[PDB]
């Protein structure tokens, strides 16, 4: 689901 992509991105940018 395309609408889930930015969540994956926020979870990586928060672990750095």
């Amino acid at each position, epitope marked *: 689901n*395309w609408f889930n992509i*930015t969540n994956x991105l*926020w979870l990586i940018x928060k672990k750095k």
Partner: antibody
Amino acid sequence: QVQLVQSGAEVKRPGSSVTVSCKASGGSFSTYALSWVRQAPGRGLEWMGGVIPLLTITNYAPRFQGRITITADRSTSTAYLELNSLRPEDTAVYYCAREGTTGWGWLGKPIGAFAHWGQGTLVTVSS
Amino acid sequence: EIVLTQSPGTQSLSPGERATLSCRASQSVGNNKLAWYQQRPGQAPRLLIYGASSRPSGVADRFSGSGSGTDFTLTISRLEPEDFAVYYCQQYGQSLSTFGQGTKVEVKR
């Protein structure tokens, strides 16, 4: 904040192209999803497609594929909708919408649904 | 493609009454990714509820969402004059997002 400001009204002929811009200002731009939604006169909301600016990962509604292009310029925080082969049925108010975050914003966790809207852009297609 | 079907087309109520709006989906909506928007006459729509039951801050406590799978409901507990407007549902549980045709809530006189 996060405010979306769109370009002004357009009048187009059948067969031509239109490009509508949306300027984001207040949050982060690259990592949040921006969608385009239109509303034809006297009708409801219809989702056209969107873009995640970060890798220009696009997502187009099947009935628009071949006619639509969605871009984003990370250096100006501006998204663009381009629609070609225009027809009178494309007469509508076009909105850009950015997804909300848990915040209420406060650049945090994205929520999918559209918390932020542009003012709308009237595109009229006629001869 | 998921078809969302809102009922009824228009709903007539008096201020202070309780409004409950329905949305039914042709298929199951994944992870309850269902939202409700309000649109006043000359305005852009405004998000009221997401993920079926989550309310953004700033949205009034009158608004609440419930439901799952195939059957969703928006409730306004005490209608304020500002609330008589059009309401839309949207599913975003697959890449092809869709909207319902909308529901008008008119003042009953």
